[PDB]
Structures are given as structure tokens and as C-alpha cells.
Symmetry: C4
């Protein structure tokens, strides 16, 4: 639980590393924009201020979403259950 | 349940207060636009009519999403289960 | 189950009726655009091809999302479980 | 489980085939853009770089979302549980 959250954290980090490199290189975004876009994509926000322009970028984004969404939201949840909720409940009492 | 919903309500309010101040100040949005954007972000709608323009805004938005999504949707759900569904079911019968 | 799906269906319909009237009137959208926008909003797609321009539209959209998201996705799910999955499984065998 | 994932995979594929043909034809998108848009829609990302322009496209998109969202996310999850998580856990040990 405290130990499992560390697994999803690495996996998420690795997923975002992959998107940051792909979109910097193929779509030509600055690395910070590429990471931002990767996060905005896999959390399903999708502002569209960055969006792939090339057919290679679109095909990767299809695959990137299907693979990553399940992971990322897995991490958000465990962060919610096993890391966020404790601190909350511990602040309720002295 | 009636008591827990009040916890998530405050926490959500505090999360949206934080986004409203950050985006008003760093991204220069009117306070109402900043709150609207914060809500549109953390519910994962993401119209993109407002989107951060500065690197500081993008880095904060990455962190803001990961922290807040789990909270907000937690509140939507409890609102659904413990506050919305009762009124519905009570209207079914006299 | 077959009976409960009918409840969420009406409630969803009523939620979308409300958005269709509000956005037609306050934001000035054609009624079909207003319904489309209401659906695109409460399912959290959020293309942003329509987005509220007035402060009244933004305040309503904040409230509309928090109230409706929980409902709508409730209906999508029951449609998935109690109406979509049966037909699927019945087609598996003669 | 290994067998059920194959069911959702076909159904998802068929759902995306339908969107690819509809949006190519009615909205006039290149087939690759149409598939990309279908995926970006049903995963609720919604960049809005493509969005339907015709009333027929908007009405279909309303129905397409309500029908498909439940399916697609069903597939993402099973992919997460029954296909993604194993490989993860098997890499943990030799
Ligand atoms: K946009
Ligand atoms: K735009
Ligand atoms: Tl945008
Ligand atoms: Tl941009
Ligand atoms: Tl979304
Ligand atoms: Tl979006
Ligand atoms: Tl937009
Ligand atoms: Tl704006
Ligand atoms: Tl958008
Ligand atoms: Tl747009
Ligand atoms: Tl428009
Ligand atoms: Tl979205
Ligand atoms: Tl866009
Ligand atoms: Tl386009």
C-alpha cells in the first residue's frame, strides 16, 4: 500500500518520460511543453492548446492514450486512497 | 456520510480557492475566469478557452491535476451517493 | 435494473433539457448546439468549440458540471451493465 | 479474463470502425483523422482540433459518446487488470 504506491509512481514517471521524448522529437515541442501535453492527455483533460499535427503523432497518441490512461488514473486513485486520505483523517484529530 | 460529505466539500473548496488565486496572479486571469478554469480542469472537461501560457503555469497545472482530480471526483461521487440519490428515491414515493 | 435504468434515463433527459434551455437563452446558441454542448460538457469530453462567454454562463457551467457529471456517468454505466452487456452476451450463443 | 479481453477488443475495434467511416464521410475527414477523432472522443480527452461542423455530425456524436464511452473504458480497465498488471508483477521477480 505504502509500498505499492511507489510502483505506480515509477511506472507513471516512465510513461510520461516516453511521451515527453516522443512529442519533443516528432512533434517538435519544447521538452516542458511535451511533458505538459503528455499529462494533459493521459488525465483526459485535453485542452488542445497542443495537439499532434503529423500522422505519426496521431497514431502514437491513439496508442499512448489506450495504454496510459489505465495506468495514470490507477496512480491518482492510490495517491487518493493510501497517501491523501490518511493525512486528511490524521488532521481531523490531534 | 452526511457528515463525511461536509469534509470533501471543504477540501474541494480549498482546492479551488488555491487554483483561483494561482491562476489570477501568475496567468493574469480575472478571479472568476480563474475559478472557472480551475473547475474545468479538475473535472477533466478541459475546453481550453483558458490554458496556461507561462512555464510556471504549466508546471503548477501538472501538479494541480494530479493532486486535485482524485479529490474532486471523490466529492462528485459522495454528492451523487449520499445527497443526490436520497432526494431522488424520496420523490419516488409520497 | 431494467426498471432502474428508466429512472436514470429520465433524470439525464431532464438534466440535458435544462442545459439546452439555459445555453440557448443566455449564451445564445441554437437549441441543437446547446444540447450538443451540454452533452459534450457533462461527459467531460470538452471540445471547446462552444464555451460560455458570459460570467453568468461560466457560473452556471461550474454548477452544471458538479451536479450532472455524477448523474450522467451513472446512466452510462447502467446502460453498460444492464442493457449493453446482455445483448452482447446473448449474441455469443444461439 | 484472458478470453474476455478479446471480446471487448473486438467490440472496441468495431466501435472505432463505425466512427472512422461516419466522420470520414459526413464530416469529410481523412480516414486517419476520423479514427483519431473517434478515439479522442470516446476516451473523453476531447482536444477539439477536429469537432463536427454539421448538425448530422453533432447528433451522431451525442449518440456515439453515450454508447461508446462505457464500452471503451471497459476495455481500458480490463487491459489494465488482466493484461497490464500481470506483466508488471512478473517483472518484479525473476
Ligand atoms: K480548443
Ligand atoms: K481553439
Ligand atoms: Tl485550445
Ligand atoms: Tl501551442
Ligand atoms: Tl475527460
Ligand atoms: Tl477537452
Ligand atoms: Tl477552446
Ligand atoms: Tl480566453
Ligand atoms: Tl479542447
Ligand atoms: Tl475547440
Ligand atoms: Tl462554435
Ligand atoms: Tl476532456
Ligand atoms: Tl483545439
Ligand atoms: Tl483540424
Amino acid at each position: 500500500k505504502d509500498k505499492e504506491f511507489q510502483v505506480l509512481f515509477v511506472l507513471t514517471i516512465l510513461t510520461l518520460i516516453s511521451g515527453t521524448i516522443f512529442y519533443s522529437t516528432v512533434e517538435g515541442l519544447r521538452p516542458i511543453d511535451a511533458l505538459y501535453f503528455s499529462v494533459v492527455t493521459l488525465t483526459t483533460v485535453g485542452y488542445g492548446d497542443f495537439s499532434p499535427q503529423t500522422d505519426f503523432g496521431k497514431i502514437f497518441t491513439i496508442l499512448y492514450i489506450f495504454i496510459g490512461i489505465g495506468l495514470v488514473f490507477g496512480f491518482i486513485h492510490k495517491l487518493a486512497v493510501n497517501v491523501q486520505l490518511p493525512s486528511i483523517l490524521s488532521n481531523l484529530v490531534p
